[PDB]
Design an enzyme around this catalytic site. Structure first.
Site, PDB file in Angstrom:
ATOM      1  N   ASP A   1      -8.985  -9.473 -14.392  1.00  0.00           N
ATOM      2  CA  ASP A   1      -9.564  -9.101 -13.789  1.00  0.00           C
ATOM      3  C   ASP A   1     -10.073  -9.698 -12.248  1.00  0.00           C
ATOM      4  OD1 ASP A   1     -11.536  -8.145 -12.688  1.00  0.00           O
ATOM      5  OD2 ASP A   1     -13.264  -9.207 -13.594  1.00  0.00           O
TER       6      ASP A   1
ATOM      7  N   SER B   1      -8.215  -1.870   4.902  1.00  0.00           N
ATOM      8  CA  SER B   1      -7.434  -0.733   4.468  1.00  0.00           C
ATOM      9  C   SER B   1      -7.189  -0.057   6.275  1.00  0.00           C
ATOM     10  CB  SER B   1      -7.573   0.067   3.626  1.00  0.00           C
ATOM     11  OG  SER B   1      -6.603   1.308   3.947  1.00  0.00           O
TER      12      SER B   1
END
Ligand SMILES: CN(Cc1ccccc1)Cc1cc(C[C@H]2CNCC[C@H]2CC(=O)Nc2nccs2)no1
Length: 330
Positions: free
Chosen positions: A35, A199
């Site tokens: 994770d 992004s």
């Protein structure tokens, strides 16, 4: 040193991925959920309330000759849904794919919430975010990656998750045969303890690319792709019959639909998520309404590039002095 381990979807929908991990001496192999959005290595154990164990493999520290109780140490975590777990702490030897760390903090669960009890295939979590998020008290502990880092050939790990198929976590090297083209690296902020990056935008299907900054985290421990409501609405508007369902808790769509791809920007590079990666199947057994793999982050407080996004790429988690993230098509 290096390590390499195969990671395997737990079910037919890629809801999560498990990776085998050797703990203790003699080795006890547990299948952990790696994770990158958390920083605790915790396991079901001989100490876990018996009624809260339903099929998981347990770590029994008393059977490990290298296990040592970390005196006074406790841990407790509440993840972003409603799930939780807590317990005490041992140090022990932990190996992943041939890479060995001695004196790793292994957080032994005394209590786990029902959602974990119900996950028969997940024996615990191995956190790969920054150690600043580790919950051990009163002395915070390091992640497996942080402990291994100085010994690794290169201070990196990579995630190569499969679609409906196994994939790989590598530590200490970049497998240049595992991706196409080049790896595009992008800046990371560690201010919130996550692999947080920005992004450069998105496209829906064959549509034109929208340049827009989307700050989010690379999180292997989240199944879906959570993005701003404007972006998500633009995606689902291209799927006839799709709608946001408050009762179901997200965008659903007719199971008969053909889903468009979703592209996200990494600098000037582009990663394309094929439409079928965005299908999470019937909302309930036998239903013709299917759950979408792209959902709004509005109720979350952060955008999350979860497995739906990450499994479309070869992803480098670069733990150099100034960390960065790398993405390649594959
Ligand atoms: C990704 N889909 C979307 C969806 C949403 C609604 C309808 C269809 C599909 C959600 C989804 C389903 C699953 C698998 C389930 C298996 N049974 C128990 C419940 C599930 C396992 C689970 O959530 N474990 C947890 N541990 C800790 C915290 S939550 N994992 O995810």
């Amino acid at each position: 040193s290096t390590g390499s381990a195969t990671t395997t979807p737990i079910d037919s929908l890629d809801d999560a991925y498990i990776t085998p991990v050797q703990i203790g001496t003699p080795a006890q192999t547990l299948n952990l959920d790696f994770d990158t959005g958390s920083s605790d290595l915790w396991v079901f154990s001989s100490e876990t309330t018996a009624s809260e164990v339903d099929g998981q493999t347990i770590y029994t520290p008393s059977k490990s000759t290298t296990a040592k109780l970390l005196s006074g140490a406790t841990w407790s975590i509440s993840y972003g849904d409603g799930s939780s777990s807590s317990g005490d702490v041992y140090t022990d030897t932990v190996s992943v794919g041939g890479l060995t760390v001695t004196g790793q903090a292994v957080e032994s669960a005394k209590k786990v919430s029902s959602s974990f009890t119900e996950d028969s295939t997940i024996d615990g979590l191995l956190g790969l975010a920054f150690s600043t998020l580790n919950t051990v008290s009163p002395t915070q502990q390091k992640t497996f990656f942080d402990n291994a880092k100085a010994s690794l050939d290169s201070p990196v790990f990579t995630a190569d998750l499969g679609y409906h198929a196994p994939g790989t976590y590598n530590f200490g090297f970049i497998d240049t045969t595992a991706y196409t083209g080049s790896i595009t690296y992008t800046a990371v902020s560690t201010k919130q303890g996550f692999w947080e990056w920005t992004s450069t935008g998105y496209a829906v299907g064959s549509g034109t690319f929208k340049s827009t900054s989307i700050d989010g985290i690379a999180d292997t421990g989240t199944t879906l792709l959570y993005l701003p409501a404007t972006v998500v609405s633009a995606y689902w508007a291209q799927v006839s019959g799709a709608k946001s369902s408050s009762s179901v808790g997200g965008y659903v769509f007719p199971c008969s639909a053909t889903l468009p791809s979703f592209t996200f920007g990494v600098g000037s590079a582009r990663i394309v998520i094929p439409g079928d990666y965005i299908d999470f199947g019937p909302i309930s057994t036998g239903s013709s309404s299917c759950f979408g793999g792209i959902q709004s982050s509005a109720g979350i407080g952060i955008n999350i590039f979860g497995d739906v996004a990450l499994k479309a790429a070869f992803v480098v988690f670069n733990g150099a002095t100034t960390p960065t993230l790398g993405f390649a098509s594959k």
